[PDB]
Amino acid sequence: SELDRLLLELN
Amino acid sequence: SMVSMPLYAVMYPVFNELERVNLSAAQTLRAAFIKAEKENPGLTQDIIMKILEKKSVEVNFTESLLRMAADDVEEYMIERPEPEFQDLNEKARALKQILSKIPDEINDRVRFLQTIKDIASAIKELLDTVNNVFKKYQYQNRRALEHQKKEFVKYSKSFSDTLKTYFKDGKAINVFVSANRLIHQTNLILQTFKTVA
Amino acid sequence: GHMRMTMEEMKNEAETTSMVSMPLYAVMYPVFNELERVNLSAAQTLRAAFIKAEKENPGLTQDIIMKILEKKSVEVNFTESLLRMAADDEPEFQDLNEKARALKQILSKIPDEINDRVRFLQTIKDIASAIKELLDTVNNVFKKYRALEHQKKEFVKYSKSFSDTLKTYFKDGKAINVFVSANRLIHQTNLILQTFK
Amino acid sequence: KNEAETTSMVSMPLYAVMYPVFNELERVNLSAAQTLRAAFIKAEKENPGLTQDIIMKILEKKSVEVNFTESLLRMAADDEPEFQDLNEKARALKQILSKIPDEINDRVRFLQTIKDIASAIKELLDTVNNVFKKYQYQNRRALEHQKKEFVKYSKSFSDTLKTYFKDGKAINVFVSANRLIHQTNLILQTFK
Amino acid sequence: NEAETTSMVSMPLYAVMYPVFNELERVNLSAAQTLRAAFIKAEKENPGLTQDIIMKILEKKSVEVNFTESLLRMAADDVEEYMIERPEPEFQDLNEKARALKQILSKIPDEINDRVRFLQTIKDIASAIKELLDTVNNVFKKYRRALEHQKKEFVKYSKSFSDTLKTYFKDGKAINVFVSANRLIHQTNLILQTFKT
Numbered sequence: 001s002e003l004d005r006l007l008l009e010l011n
Numbered sequence: 012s013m014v015s016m017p018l019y020a021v022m023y024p025v026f027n028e029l030e031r032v033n034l035s036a037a038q039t040l041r042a043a044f045i046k047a048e049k050e051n052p053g054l055t056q057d058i059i060m061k062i063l064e065k066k067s068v069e070v071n072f073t074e075s076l077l078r079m080a081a082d083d084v085e086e087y088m089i090e091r092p093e094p095e096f097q098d099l100n101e102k103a104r105a106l107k108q109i110l111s112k113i114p115d116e117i118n119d120r121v122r123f124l125q126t127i128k129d130i131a132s133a134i135k136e137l138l139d140t141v142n143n144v145f146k147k148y149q150y151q152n153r154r155a156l157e158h159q160k161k162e163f164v165k166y167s168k169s170f171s172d173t174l175k176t177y178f179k180d181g182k183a184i185n186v187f188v189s190a191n192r193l194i195h196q197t198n199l200i201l202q203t204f205k206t207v208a
Numbered sequence: 209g210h211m212r213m214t215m216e217e218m219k220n221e222a223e224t225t226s227m228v229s230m231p232l233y234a235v236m237y238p239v240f241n242e243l244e245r246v247n248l249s250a251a252q253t254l255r256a257a258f259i260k261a262e263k264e265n266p267g268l269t270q271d272i273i274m275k276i277l278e279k280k281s282v283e284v285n286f287t288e289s290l291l292r293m294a295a296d297d298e299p300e301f302q303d304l305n306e307k308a309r310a311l312k313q314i315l316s317k318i319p320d321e322i323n324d325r326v327r328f329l330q331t332i333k334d335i336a337s338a339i340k341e342l343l344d345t346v347n348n349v350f351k352k353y354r355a356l357e358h359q360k361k362e363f364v365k366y367s368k369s370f371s372d373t374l375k376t377y378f379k380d381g382k383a384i385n386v387f388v389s390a391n392r393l394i395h396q397t398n399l400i401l402q403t404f405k
Numbered sequence: 406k407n408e409a410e411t412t413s414m415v416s417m418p419l420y421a422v423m424y425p426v427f428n429e430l431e432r433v434n435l436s437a438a439q440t441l442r443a444a445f446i447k448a449e450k451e452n453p454g455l456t457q458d459i460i461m462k463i464l465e466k467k468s469v470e471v472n473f474t475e476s477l478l479r480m481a482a483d484d485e486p487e488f489q490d491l492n493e494k495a496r497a498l499k500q501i502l503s504k505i506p507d508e509i510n511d512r513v514r515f516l517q518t519i520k521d522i523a524s525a526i527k528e529l530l531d532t533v534n535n536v537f538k539k540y541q542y543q544n545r546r547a548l549e550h551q552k553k554e555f556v557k558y559s560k561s562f563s564d565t566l567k568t569y570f571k572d573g574k575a576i577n578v579f580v581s582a583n584r585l586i587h588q589t590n591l592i593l594q595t596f597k
Numbered sequence: 598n599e600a601e602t603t604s605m606v607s608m609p610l611y612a613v614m615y616p617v618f619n620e621l622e623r624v625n626l627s628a629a630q631t632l633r634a635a636f637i638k639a640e641k642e643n644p645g646l647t648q649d650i651i652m653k654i655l656e657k658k659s660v661e662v663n664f665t666e667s668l669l670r671m672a673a674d675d676v677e678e679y680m681i682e683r684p685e686p687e688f689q690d691l692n693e694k695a696r697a698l699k700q701i702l703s704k705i706p707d708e709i710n711d712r713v714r715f716l717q718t719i720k721d722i723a724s725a726i727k728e729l730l731d732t733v734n735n736v737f738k739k740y741r742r743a744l745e746h747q748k749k750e751f752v753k754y755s756k757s758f759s760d761t762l763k764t765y766f767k768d769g770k771a772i773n774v775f776v777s778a779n780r781l782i783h784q785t786n787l788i789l790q791t792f793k794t
Contacts, residue, residue, distance in 0.1 A: 002127060002128055002131055003171070003174070004012055005131060005156060006131050006134070006135075006167070006168075006171045007168065009135055010140070010167055010168055010171070011163055012233055012469065012472070013469055013472075013473075014231070016230065019237045019238060020230055020233040020234060023233065024225075025219050025224065027213050027218065027221060028213075028218050028221065028222055030212070030213055030218070031215070031218070034212075038210055044269055045241075091223045105210040113282075173388070185366050225452065227477060227480055228477060230473065231470065231473065234466075234469065234473065235463060235466050235470060239459060239462045242462065243455075243458075243459075247448070247451075247452050247455065249451070250448035250451065250452060250455060253444050253447060254444050254445070254448060255442075256444075257440045257441050258446040259442065260437075260440070261437040261441060263432075264436075265434055265437060267587060268430075268437060269436070270474070270477075271430075272426055272441075272462055273470055274426075274459060274470070274474065274580050275426045275429070276422060276426070276463050276464070277463070277464065277470060277471075278574075278577075279421075279422050279425075279426070280464065282418075282421050282422060283418065283422070283460055283461070283464060285612065286417060286418060286421065287614075288613045289414075289608060289611040290414075290415070290600055290610075290611075291507075291612045292615040292616070292619075293414070293599060293600065293603065293611045293615075294599065296599060296637070298470065316451075317619050318615050319616070320615075320619040321619075323528070327623075336531070337625060378560055382690075384464075388461075391590075395598070400424065410605065411605075412605040413598050413601045413602070413603060413604060413605060414603045414605050414608050414611075415601055415609060416605060417605050417608060420605075423646065433779065444718050453601055454600065455602065525676040
């Protein structure tokens with residue numbers, strides 16, 4: 001889950 | 012027969028992709044390898060393999076190079092006493108700190124799982140301290156600031172993608188190299204946000 | 209001088225490393241490199257177009273190459289024609305002109321003599337006689353009448369090369385080497401006459 | 406002016422060799438076909454005879470390219486119930502086609518191999534029909550067209566086989582096998 | 598050079614006419630020279646003229662189909678032409694076997710259309726060639742410079758005739774068959790003329 005949490009806040 | 016293919020398939024691309032860093036050196040080494048390969052067919056392959064066999068040494072060095080990228084280097088340090096600027100100095104300090112310790116945590120699933128969560132937090136919090144500091148600059152003069160934010164965001168994605176590949180690969184050097192680039196980037200954030208201020 | 213690579217070219221090249229893309233490096237890169245010295249803009253643009261095309265659709269260069277090798281008989285035919293075309297041009301200079309015309313004449317007729325072994329063998333004897341008679345007139349004019357020295361030496365070098373090519377053909381059966389070679393020897397005959405002009 | 410417009414004889418290989426290649430390519434890749442053609446036209450018009458020079462440097466590498474093509478075929482090995490069946494029967498075909506360079510210099514074994522290929526194709530082909538007749542994938546006749554493409558190249562492989570027995574040129578079989586391997590890979594990508 | 602200065606439309610001169618002139622040059626030196634020079638001059642003054650000449654020739658192929666067929670059909674009149682006036686069994690045999698072959702070849706335009714009946718005509722022709730050859734060697738050993746030279750030529754043209762059939766069942770272009778059949782009829786006649794002297 002933490003892998004996707006980064007990309008969401010970066011986009 | 013191409014005992015010589017690796018010259019073109021490995022070395023040419025390697026030199027081509029290093030042209031923006033330095034052009035003349037890329038050219039002189041290309042020429043060097045080409046001349047060596049023509050006098051000695053198969054030499055470039057033998058060289059490449061001897062480099063690949065030094066994987067251990069090169070991992071150890073890249074670890075060291077990362078571990079050293081952190082410690083507060085006497086150059087990038089915003090002089091402004093304002094709380095927003097000070098919060099930037101330290102959130103970058105924390106990110107550089109956490110990224111530099113990757114080499115000593117990656118070989119343990121549990122600890123590295125914690126480290127990834129902390130890196131994500133450290134990145135996010137730096138993004139917050141960059142967003143909070145925008146108001147301190149004349150709003151018609153943020154081209155560089157915004158551009159440097161985007162570049163940092165690019166290399167953060169790049170590190171996240173690198174970290175995704177690690178769990179499928181197991182190849183730690185990519186992580187180390189990516190993490191070092193990110194440190195260099197947070198330094199450029201500090202450099203940019205110090206020059207306009 | 210040397211080709212420059214763009215950021216986009218650099219990115220693409222780094223992302224195209226699968227085996228099906230190796231002909232781009234093993235075949236096209238050495239071509240671009242040799243093209244680079246004479247025609248810098250063409251080499252630059254053609255590599256740029258190949259890199260992009262290969263990046264988006266791996267296997268493309270190999271396809272293009274294999275389709276070129278498929279069309280070999282067209283190139284043999286074309287080279288045959290270039291050769292046949294290559295001959296269309298004080299009494300001591302008249303003797304030199306006639307015997308240079310005579311050599312270029314026999315050589316240009318190779319594509320049509322090579323088919324019959326008896327005829328080609330006589331053709332080879334006729335070529336040998338033409339070279340004797342031409343060199344005799346060259347030795348004659350140098351004694352009767354000075355930056356024309358090296359062309360004689362070059363003629364011999366290409367004459368001797370054409371000889372070794374014949375022997376390679378009787379082993380291989382690939383008649384294309386002989387046509388290319390004969391066309392070079394016709395050019396060397398033209399270079400000699402140009403120096404007197 | 407006028408002489409700059411009129412095409413010289415030494416430029417013919419651009420039209421006799423490169424253009425048919427780009428025209429064939431344009432069907433499956435417009436942008437690549439356009440840009441490369443534009444590059445070659447730009448290059449040739451500026452320095453006539455250049456395209457001919459390229460062709461010759463490539464024919465010069467015939468045997469290297471022939472060895473590599475075979476090499477690529479030998480490496481083709483390395484790359485839900487019904488979807489597992491689809492994966493399995495695609496793997497079977499690629500593996501058997503990859504064995505061609507070992508069986509080609511043995512007329513007895515090669516015929517056995519050709520038979521094995523014929524079977525492996527049919528097995529893959531009705532597997533495709535099974536997945537379409539049990540799921541109906543979100544993709545349109547794009548799968549159906551890709552099937553048609555596979556069948557086209559599958560018979561193209563067969564025509565290359567009959568030519569091989571008459572001329573002996575094994576490279577064309579390697580090339581055709583490789584294309585057939587690509588067609589089966591496109592089947593899988595469309596199905597994913 | 599000359600390849601750059603020559604327009605692409607002129608290529609037919611070198612791909613088609615030159616090889617024709619080159620083969621002629623072995624037989625008639627002046628005829629090829631005169632004709633080549635005329636074409637050279639014509640092409641220089643009007644580029645594309647050779648190509649137009651060739652295209653207009655191909656357009657009129659039917660005339661040529663009709664012509665060669667005629668000459669084959671009419672050969673039936675000349676079936677007893679060149680009978681050796683000698684009262685000996687071997688020579689009586691040589692006349693008869695040559696008579697039969699020339700007669701059978703002049704029947705080709707009738708049997709050609711239906712390939713079923715044409716197949717059972719191929720057998721008869723081959724049988725006639727074989728039986729003529731068997732009689733050719735009968736006379737030779739009872740009755741070399743020019744004597745065996747004709748026999749050699751007969752074999753070459755007879756197999757050339759056979760190789761023409763295989764191309765016919767793939768083209769449907771009876772002209773090639775008409776042409777070769779006629780050459781074999783002429784070759785049969787050259788044999789009979791050798792034993793006349």
